[PDB]
Amino acid sequence: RIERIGAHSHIRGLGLDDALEPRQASQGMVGQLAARRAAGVVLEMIREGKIAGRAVLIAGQPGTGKTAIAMGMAQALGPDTPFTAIAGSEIFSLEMSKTEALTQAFRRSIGVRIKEETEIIEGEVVEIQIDRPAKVGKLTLKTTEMETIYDLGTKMIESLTKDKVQAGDVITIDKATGKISKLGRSFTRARDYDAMGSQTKFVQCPDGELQKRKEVVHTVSLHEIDVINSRTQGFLALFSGDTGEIKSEVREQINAKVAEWREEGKAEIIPGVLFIDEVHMLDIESFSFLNRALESDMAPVLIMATNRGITRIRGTSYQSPHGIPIDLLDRLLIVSTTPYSEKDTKQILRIRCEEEDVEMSEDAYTVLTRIGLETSLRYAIQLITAASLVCRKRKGTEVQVDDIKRVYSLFLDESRSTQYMKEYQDA
Amino acid sequence: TQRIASHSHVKGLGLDESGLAKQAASGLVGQENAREACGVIVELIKSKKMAGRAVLLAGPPGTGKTALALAIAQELGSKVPFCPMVGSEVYSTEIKKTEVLMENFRRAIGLRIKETKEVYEGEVTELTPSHVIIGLKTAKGTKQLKLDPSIFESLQKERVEAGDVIYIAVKRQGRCDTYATEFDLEAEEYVPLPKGDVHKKKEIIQDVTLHDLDVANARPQGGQDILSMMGQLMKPKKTEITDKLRGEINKVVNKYIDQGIAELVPGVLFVDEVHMLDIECFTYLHRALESSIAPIVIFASNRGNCVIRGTEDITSPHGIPLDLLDRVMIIRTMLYTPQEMKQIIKIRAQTEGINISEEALNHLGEIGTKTTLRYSVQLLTPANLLAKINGKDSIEKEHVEEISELFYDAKSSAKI
Amino acid sequence: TQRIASHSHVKGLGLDESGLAKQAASGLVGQENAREACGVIVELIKSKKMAGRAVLLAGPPGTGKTALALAIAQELGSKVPFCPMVGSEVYSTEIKKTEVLMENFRRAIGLRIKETKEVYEGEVTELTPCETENPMGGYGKTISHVIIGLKTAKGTKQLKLDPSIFESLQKERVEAGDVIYIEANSGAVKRQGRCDTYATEFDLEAEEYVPLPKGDVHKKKEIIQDVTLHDLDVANARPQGGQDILSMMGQLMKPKKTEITDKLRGEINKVVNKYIDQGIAELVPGVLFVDEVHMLDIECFTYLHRALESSIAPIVIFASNRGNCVIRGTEDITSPHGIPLDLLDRVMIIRTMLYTPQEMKQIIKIRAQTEGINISEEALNHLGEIGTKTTLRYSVQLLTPANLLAKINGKDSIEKEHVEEISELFYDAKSSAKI
Amino acid sequence: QRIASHSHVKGLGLDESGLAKQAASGLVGQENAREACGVIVELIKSKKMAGRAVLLAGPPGTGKTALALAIAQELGSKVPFCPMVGSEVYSTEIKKTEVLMENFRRAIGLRIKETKEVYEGEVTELTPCEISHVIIGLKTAKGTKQLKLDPSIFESLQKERVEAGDVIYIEANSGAVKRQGRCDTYATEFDLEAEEYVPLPKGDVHKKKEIIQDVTLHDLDVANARPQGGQDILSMMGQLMKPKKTEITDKLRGEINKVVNKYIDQGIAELVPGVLFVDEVHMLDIECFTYLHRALESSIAPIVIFASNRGNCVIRGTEDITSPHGIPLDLLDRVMIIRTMLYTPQEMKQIIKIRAQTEGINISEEALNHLGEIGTKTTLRYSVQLLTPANLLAKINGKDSIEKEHVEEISELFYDAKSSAKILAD
Amino acid sequence: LTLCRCGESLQDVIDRVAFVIPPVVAAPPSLRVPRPPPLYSHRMRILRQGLREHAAPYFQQLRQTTAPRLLQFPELRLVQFDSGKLEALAILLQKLKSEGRRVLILSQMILMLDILEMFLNFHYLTYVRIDENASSEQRQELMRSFNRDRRIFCAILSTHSRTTGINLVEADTVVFYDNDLNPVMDAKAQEW
Ligand SMILES: Nc1ncnc2c1ncn2[C@@H]1O[C@H](COP(=O)(O)OP(=O)(O)O)[C@@H](O)[C@H]1O
Numbered sequence A: 001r002i003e004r005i006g007a008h009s010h011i012r013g014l015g016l017d018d019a020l021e022p023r024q025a026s027q028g029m030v031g032q033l034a035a036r037r038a039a040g041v042v043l044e045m046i047r048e049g050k051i052a053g054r055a056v057l058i059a060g061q062p063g064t065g066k067t068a069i070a071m072g073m074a075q076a077l078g079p080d081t082p083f084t085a086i087a088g089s090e091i092f093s094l095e096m097s098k099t100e101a102l103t104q105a106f107r108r109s110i111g112v113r114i115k116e117e118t119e120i121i122e123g124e125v126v127e128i129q130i131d132r133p134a135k136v137g138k139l140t141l142k143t144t145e146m147e148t149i150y151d152l153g154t155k156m157i158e159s160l161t162k163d164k165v166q167a168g169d170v171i172t173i174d175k176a177t178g179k180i181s182k183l184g185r186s187f188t189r190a191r192d193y194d195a196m197g198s199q200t201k202f203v204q205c206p207d208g209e210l211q212k213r214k215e216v217v218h219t220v221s222l223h224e225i226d227v228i229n230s231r232t233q234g235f236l237a238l239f240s241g242d243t244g245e246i247k248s249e250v251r252e253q254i255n256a257k258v259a260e261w262r263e264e265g266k267a268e269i270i271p272g273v274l275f276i277d278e279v280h281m282l283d284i285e286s287f288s289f290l291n292r293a294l295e296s297d298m299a300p301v302l303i304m305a306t307n308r309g310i311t312r313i314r315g316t317s318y319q320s321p322h323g324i325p326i327d328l329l330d331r332l333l334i335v336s337t338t339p340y341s342e343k344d345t346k347q348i349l350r351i352r353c354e355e356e357d358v359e360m361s362e363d364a365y366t367v368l369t370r371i372g373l374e375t376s377l378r379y380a381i382q383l384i385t386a387a388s389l390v391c392r393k394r395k396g397t398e399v400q401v402d403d404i405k406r407v408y409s410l411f412l413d414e415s416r417s418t419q420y421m422k423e424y425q426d427a
Numbered sequence B: 001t002q003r004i005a006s007h008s009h010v011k012g013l014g015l016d017e018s019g020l021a022k023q024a025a026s027g028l029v030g031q032e033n034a035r036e037a038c039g040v041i042v043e044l045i046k047s048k049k050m051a052g053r054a055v056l057l058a059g060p061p062g063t064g065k066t067a068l069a070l071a072i073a074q075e076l077g078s079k080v081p082f083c084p085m086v087g088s089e090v091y092s093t094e095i096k097k098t099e100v101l102m103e104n105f106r107r108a109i110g111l112r113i114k115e116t117k118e119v120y121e122g123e124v125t126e127l128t129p130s131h132v133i134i135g136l137k138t139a140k141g142t143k144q145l146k147l148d149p150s151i152f153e154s155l156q157k158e159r160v161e162a163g164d165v166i167y168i169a170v171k172r173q174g175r176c177d178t179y180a181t182e183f184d185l186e187a188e189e190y191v192p193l194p195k196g197d198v199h200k201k202k203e204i205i206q207d208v209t210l211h212d213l214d215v216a217n218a219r220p221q222g223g224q225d226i227l228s229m230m231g232q233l234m235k236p237k238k239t240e241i242t243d244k245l246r247g248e249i250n251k252v253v254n255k256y257i258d259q260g261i262a263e264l265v266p267g268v269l270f271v272d273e274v275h276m277l278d279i280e281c282f283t284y285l286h287r288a289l290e291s292s293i294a295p296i297v298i299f300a301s302n303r304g305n306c307v308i309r310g311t312e313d314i315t316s317p318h319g320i321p322l323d324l325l326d327r328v329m330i331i332r333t334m335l336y337t338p339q340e341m342k343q344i345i346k347i348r349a350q351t352e353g354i355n356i357s358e359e360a361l362n363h364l365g366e367i368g369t370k371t372t373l374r375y376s377v378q379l380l381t382p383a384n385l386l387a388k389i390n391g392k393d394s395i396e397k398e399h400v401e402e403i404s405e406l407f408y409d410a411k412s413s414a415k416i
Numbered sequence C: 001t002q003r004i005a006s007h008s009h010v011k012g013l014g015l016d017e018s019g020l021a022k023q024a025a026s027g028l029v030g031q032e033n034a035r036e037a038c039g040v041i042v043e044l045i046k047s048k049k050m051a052g053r054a055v056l057l058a059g060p061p062g063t064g065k066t067a068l069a070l071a072i073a074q075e076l077g078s079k080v081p082f083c084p085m086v087g088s089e090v091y092s093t094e095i096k097k098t099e100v101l102m103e104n105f106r107r108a109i110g111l112r113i114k115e116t117k118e119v120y121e122g123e124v125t126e127l128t129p130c131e132t133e134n135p136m137g138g139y140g141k142t143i144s145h146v147i148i149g150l151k152t153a154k155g156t157k158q159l160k161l162d163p164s165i166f167e168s169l170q171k172e173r174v175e176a177g178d179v180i181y182i183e184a185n186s187g188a189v190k191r192q193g194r195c196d197t198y199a200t201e202f203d204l205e206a207e208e209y210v211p212l213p214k215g216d217v218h219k220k221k222e223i224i225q226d227v228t229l230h231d232l233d234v235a236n237a238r239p240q241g242g243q244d245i246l247s248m249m250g251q252l253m254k255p256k257k258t259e260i261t262d263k264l265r266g267e268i269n270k271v272v273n274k275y276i277d278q279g280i281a282e283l284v285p286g287v288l289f290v291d292e293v294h295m296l297d298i299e300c301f302t303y304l305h306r307a308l309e310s311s312i313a314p315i316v317i318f319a320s321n322r323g324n325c326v327i328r329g330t331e332d333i334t335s336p337h338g339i340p341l342d343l344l345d346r347v348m349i350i351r352t353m354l355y356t357p358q359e360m361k362q363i364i365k366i367r368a369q370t371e372g373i374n375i376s377e378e379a380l381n382h383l384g385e386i387g388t389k390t391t392l393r394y395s396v397q398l399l400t401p402a403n404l405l406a407k408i409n410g411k412d413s414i415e416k417e418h419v420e421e422i423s424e425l426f427y428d429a430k431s432s433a434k435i
Numbered sequence D: 001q002r003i004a005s006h007s008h009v010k011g012l013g014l015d016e017s018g019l020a021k022q023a024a025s026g027l028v029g030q031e032n033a034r035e036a037c038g039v040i041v042e043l044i045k046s047k048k049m050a051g052r053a054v055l056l057a058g059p060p061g062t063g064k065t066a067l068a069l070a071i072a073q074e075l076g077s078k079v080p081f082c083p084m085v086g087s088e089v090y091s092t093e094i095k096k097t098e099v100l101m102e103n104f105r106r107a108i109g110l111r112i113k114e115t116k117e118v119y120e121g122e123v124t125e126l127t128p129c130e131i132s133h134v135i136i137g138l139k140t141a142k143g144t145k146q147l148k149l150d151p152s153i154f155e156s157l158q159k160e161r162v163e164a165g166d167v168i169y170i171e172a173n174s175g176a177v178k179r180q181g182r183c184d185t186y187a188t189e190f191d192l193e194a195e196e197y198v199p200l201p202k203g204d205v206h207k208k209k210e211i212i213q214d215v216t217l218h219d220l221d222v223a224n225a226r227p228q229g230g231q232d233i234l235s236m237m238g239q240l241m242k243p244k245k246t247e248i249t250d251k252l253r254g255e256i257n258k259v260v261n262k263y264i265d266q267g268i269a270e271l272v273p274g275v276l277f278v279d280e281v282h283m284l285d286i287e288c289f290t291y292l293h294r295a296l297e298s299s300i301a302p303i304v305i306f307a308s309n310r311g312n313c314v315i316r317g318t319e320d321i322t323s324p325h326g327i328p329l330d331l332l333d334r335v336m337i338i339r340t341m342l343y344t345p346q347e348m349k350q351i352i353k354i355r356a357q358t359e360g361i362n363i364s365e366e367a368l369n370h371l372g373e374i375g376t377k378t379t380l381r382y383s384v385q386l387l388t389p390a391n392l393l394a395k396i397n398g399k400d401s402i403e404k405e406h407v408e409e410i411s412e413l414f415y416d417a418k419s420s421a422k423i424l425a426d
Numbered sequence E: 001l002t003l004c005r006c007g008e009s010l011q012d013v014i015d016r017v018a019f020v021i022p023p024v025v026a027a028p029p030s031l032r033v034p035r036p037p038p039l040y041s042h043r044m045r046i047l048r049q050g051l052r053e054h055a056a057p058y059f060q061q062l063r064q065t066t067a068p069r070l071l072q073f074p075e076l077r078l079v080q081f082d083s084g085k086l087e088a089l090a091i092l093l094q095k096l097k098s099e100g101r102r103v104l105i106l107s108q109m110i111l112m113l114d115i116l117e118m119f120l121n122f123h124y125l126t127y128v129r130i131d132e133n134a135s136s137e138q139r140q141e142l143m144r145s146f147n148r149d150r151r152i153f154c155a156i157l158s159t160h161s162r163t164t165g166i167n168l169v170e171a172d173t174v175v176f177y178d179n180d181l182n183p184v185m186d187a188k189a190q191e192w
């Protein structure tokens, strides 16, 4: 519950209507109807997943809400669909090539819902009488509507001895493997032992004696390749990034078995999204790889964001729009974000204030909207926070003009920093 | 259903009996000379006589060189391996670059080997022990096998009532014998008694590539000696040596071949984005193509006359040096006309599952010939979604117009 | 050993109750607006309401940016963690730059985890009161309870524990006369060792005899452990327990610091939230002071202005000393403070003016005081004058050598002659430029 | 013998008075550089100085490497001589500075004087008594006795699969090994056991001899850079990086130096400083020259001979700084520079004749003149290279010696750098 | 602490690792072995000493040795999914067991009997198979074991034997999995 509000916490989805009509202000967003409708339609395409290898480029001036609309789409997509957010400079690893990192990122945003039929027996253990030779045992499971006694085997008795199960424990035994899983207790333990005090759990299902076809959908991403590349996979799946596995017999074989599962009804493919923020940092080799990697059937939807116009492509000398080669730039379609006006800026500032739980006068809102239209929006939020803190220190109830104007001089913007920078501190 | 891809519409070259390139067939359209050259190339591949040859599918962007190579692969068939590669793939941080290209050349080649495996299955009746005289029982009969100690099982593998299946080089405890009536609740699950004979030999025609054997003999993981387990305990790697690469492997493969044990299956290696490879890659490819054991390689370049990477001083056509560019045949693909653009747009819409009206198709073809064909191809799906939202089953001109208004092409974004 | 560091006089921002700035601000002098901004941002940190916020301590060299940084750090107190980092440390040959930055961000975040355990200890006197066989079945011999006579230094208290634990008692060598470590819920017995009262001087053995427990038998030990999120990341990264990890050749290379985002985020964050909302731990976000931020590559800034966008990112205090300079890793891309113009928009710039000659004199005097050497009025005036001429940091470095020269010359206080001689024996770079 | 490029150089060619003869010991001319070489070789033989540097500077093909090999030969195999190349410093698993320090350490050698004795004995007489005391029998071709050993030797012996009738070597201080069979294993007619047998050893049952093993400090460092084996720490598999990344100097090299000094004071060890010949010095980076001009100043640095072929050029790693000999002025100073002069046509012909005599090729008078002319035309190395195929063709054509026709034909067949560049303009 | 190692909500890590293991090594051979016709005693002795030293720490056991996978057997689910008849049979048997009625499964092919055996094992339904291989007395013994034994749920018959030995019925529920439409077979089959 203790998680602080970040720069994109004010947004909590992409405000859209039944007909995908964008709204002025909803779900923490304001203005920018065109790019928001583009986000809505690409999100509909993602949730459809019928087509693979689609790319979208979010372009615009800084502070136009590129990362904002990206996080909004991520939120609107909701759980059950992977959304791999990554920065352009994260692919540069000292233990795995750029192409390998891109393959990892692509396969990481693809999920397979594996269906598994289970048969679990549950109930209340009324009698767990076990005859230890130092071989024979019987279990008396009880439910709210029926009871049954089961003769325990040697291995089952040993498993029960492993996980201590006293009378009155709510357990869920899997008839397939016999794994002992304790859920709780139905009553106290004799009220006499001067220890082991806990709370009592609710009774089990009436038909819990034998659940026939308990369906559990195990969801896992296509990053499962780490499970095969090495005999010990937890080390690679948890921390180790040195996963330069062999592409042959791993990628192709896993894809083939995933197709077999999809055809045989075991699992279903759920393509996610790969959001590369500041994609301009990718080397030209990474762009050349994305050009071809984006053509596979397992290719997720590649959302990208650029904050530049004509700029040199990293790893070469010639320039291209958005710092992306002409090929990949032409392949994808671009979503331009128009700057926000004064009203939109004021509304965004008000939404941020509401998020931060801070209140300020109308004149404060006006002067702060002015300052934000002049300097920037993020700087306006910084001033919101600073003025709220100055007001709290001042013992006031709401932020007045005298606090925003004070923190404006206390904290400087880059435009004024460079102005006072004429002291030639260093070069 | 299977999700659509970028090149899932191409099914093959779609040539006539004499190789005549039809206007449109097998998903492809246009590029008659290119598709005829590709027919000749697949004939070469099927010949399985020449080795080390290569071809360059150099052409302007959007001509379909990649889709063309994928159609070539489809036409060739799944038997002959077709290894796709990106120029950036060669750049690795654990294996040498030229060695990456070498292992690619190797995996590109296929090999179909035949082997007879003796399998021992049945419920274990006796497990008395170095050599272990195990007893397997099946519906046919019982046999006391004089198995070797190397197969002695470490895990539970109960002495009795355990169903085991062994083959000569690991054992698999299938499941517990069908004693479900002995106990009412037991952790172990049961399977029926195997009906097949204990000792059975089955011939499996397995298809593998030469690089599989290469990397396997490089760092084997079989055997039972402790030194082996300690060697393969952690950090697998690459960079097989040339002496083991050639020599022993080629000799054993030729042995299997001339003895009827295996059958060589030459494949293809599609090195895409060759225009951005370093000069070292080209210098190694010089000798690679000039080898009696190198497979066919299909290159797909997109750049024109540009500076070769790794030198940043000298320029050459197609970003490939002249000495190499001459070693590979050139396939010149031309740009599609607005009519062909509209035709391929309609083909993709049919494959992609989208219904488009005549006016909508015309507007899409116009937007394509104006900005880019692939741009309209990308706009196809958004228009279908807009139609669905608006309740229209088929796309109309207004839908594609609104879509274009929402999404700006690369050219328009650059104009801004 | 006091081991006076370069600048240890700073003890805090020294702001008045009203939040304004004063001269004697707990060691640090001058820099009114800068210290007020430091107070505002430290109040922000204490609020623990905002995350991913960065501040830039831009200012010419010698303005004491690191000084005020350590001041605000001390003001925060040892309670919240403070991870100092320099731009050069990001360049690692084994782990990528962005992952080092993320590890530093994690270190900057603290987390106090409490743990209360009810345990019983004392000299055991085992005895099983015979009880009639299970009344539900037939007859025979059973045990319904097992009484353990735990004897502690304060007294004795018999515990009628559950009989099922008898297996644990027999498992370990729990004989009458030894100290056992009982657990309330688990019940597992862990023998500490025999009582020292029986440790005869003639018995040769160690680690087997332990003193009697002091206090009541029932002890509710409350312990708190403060570990940063990076500590938990590292702990959950590497394995432990068998699995042939004892190998030397193929395992001694412990520097596998490479980390993935799935483990870093996700499960760890969820378990942290579970411990927080359950009452087992309390999150404590700290601060990440990054001096020489201009030394980072553009591949580092492009990841910084994305990590700062996360809700979990802590407060970062950048301190750039250079001016308009080309960004590292870029082709003649000049930007203010050597930082891309895109990141400067996300940081609050706290400008620091140059110290007034009077402030120079105050700094020299307080540094001399901290060093513990008396300086005459004339010597202090000469030190202030030379600190006005050249860089101020040169004067403070002339105190200890001048002090030693004075002590060796037979005098206690630093006379003007001593500083005059040291200025000719040692000089600054501005004068050394005369090649 | 597989005559090499510097085989005829079997010495430096200095007389008793120290002057360099006009032509002797395989060398011809170059009296000044030969005198400098004969002075620095005496400097090295003095064994008193340390870290002194030398630079054999001069145009290409002047014999600087020949002079280095002559110095090495004159010094003799009793002192280490490490032939080193600049490109070798660019290691992938060890830093350049560390490779340079390892080469410096290799350039220092010490002789270990030790008198070891053995206690070979018969296993059939194995009769322990008490595990606390054991006795072994001795039966050689010259005598028979018995010995008494500490039970530790009996443990180390039973560790090996000893059998009756085997020859076992027992050292007086530590160690033991088995030799199977003493003319009794093949007698019983039992088949082989994957090992070869050996008859009983001759000589006395107890032997003693003086031992002198030439070991260098780098060997000690490498041996101390590992756990030495023994217990579970003995784990060793393929790919083991025996040349580990680096080894600290204060706590590892310092201890080696201390123990060496101790054993020298005790008279057990004798130090013999060697020479470090670093060829193609211009290939080293500036960050290597800066550490080299400082490491050779230590009290333990040996004599280092340098050789810079190319003249003034840009220093490696700088791209802007240019210094003579491709070496910075910092390292250039403090290094005695020995200038090598070019050879005259008569000296070239004499060197060609010496090469022909050494390699076994026989050349005629007119043939020698033509070969010397072809050499002075472009370079002596071209004539040295053409000398062999000339005699090869002569043998093919049935001629024992080389004539004008054969030399002219082989010169027209192949081409030199000058000729190649002349025709390369096409 | 405990982690999920994946995106699933909650599940045993062992189950996670056991579910997804598609690939097996393509062609792993044994290790290379130098073959010098003479083997010097020194190297062989050193190698034997090394093997003995490595075998001494056996207390670890390498946790099953983590041996590679080389078989990749087919999933048991495919037995049912491969045929809708078996899915309908699963539904019917689940219904009948929820009702408590035994089942008498009738099939014609012995291979189909093995298929039904694997299917019931997938459903954990205890069964007793009576086929032609078992002699008349063995068939009667199997029928007697099925009768009066409420722990046995299903009974599988071949429908091609005489079956004149069966005497008593338990739950009066029969399932004709296969239909033969043969002249004499079906007649006497349905009759008995
Ligand atoms: N539509 C919007 N609604 C609310 N805040 C916005 C919006 N657009 C931009 N911002 C704010 O501007 C700052 C930077 O803009 P951002 O959302 O990152 O877009 P961009 O990626 O173009 O900078 C952020 O702090 C963000 O909160």
Ligand SMILES: Nc1ncnc2c1ncn2[C@@H]1O[C@H](COP(=O)(O)OP(=O)(O)O)[C@@H](O)[C@H]1O
Residues within 6 Å of the ligand: B006, B007, B009, B027, B028, B029, B030, B031, B059, B060, B061, B062, B063, B064, B065, B066, B067, B068, B300, B344, B347, B348, B374, B377
């Ligand atoms: N001959 C063709 N027939 C049908 N569609 C084509 C043809 N050539 C190209 N395409 C289409 O053009 C799109 C891009 O072609 P592509 O293979 O990427 O060209 P390139 O290889 O030059 O990048 C593909 O999605 C495919 O639909």
Ligand SMILES: Nc1ncnc2c1ncn2[C@@H]1O[C@H](COP(=O)(O)OP(=O)(O)O)[C@@H](O)[C@H]1O
Residues within 6 Å of the ligand: C006, C007, C008, C009, C027, C028, C029, C030, C031, C060, C061, C062, C063, C064, C065, C066, C067, C068, C321, C362, C363, C366, C367, C393, C396
């Ligand atoms: N206001 C001040 N009062 C006392 N000492 C100061 C003050 N400002 C700077 N100093 C001194 O300056 C020295 C270093 O300052 P520092 O924080 O490193 O600035 P910069 O990093 O810009 O050089 C410290 O040793 C400290 O003693």
Ligand SMILES: Nc1ncnc2c1ncn2[C@@H]1O[C@H](COP(=O)(O)OP(=O)(O)O)[C@@H](O)[C@H]1O
Residues within 6 Å of the ligand: D005, D006, D008, D026, D027, D028, D029, D030, D059, D060, D061, D062, D063, D064, D065, D066, D067, D309, D351, D354, D380
């Ligand atoms: N003084 C000499 N007398 C005889 N032969 C010489 C003499 N100097 C050089 N040579 C020969 O000339 C060749 C030059 O080789 P080298 O010493 O490598 O030249 P550089 O001076 O470039 O090192 C050597 O092979 C050597 O045999």
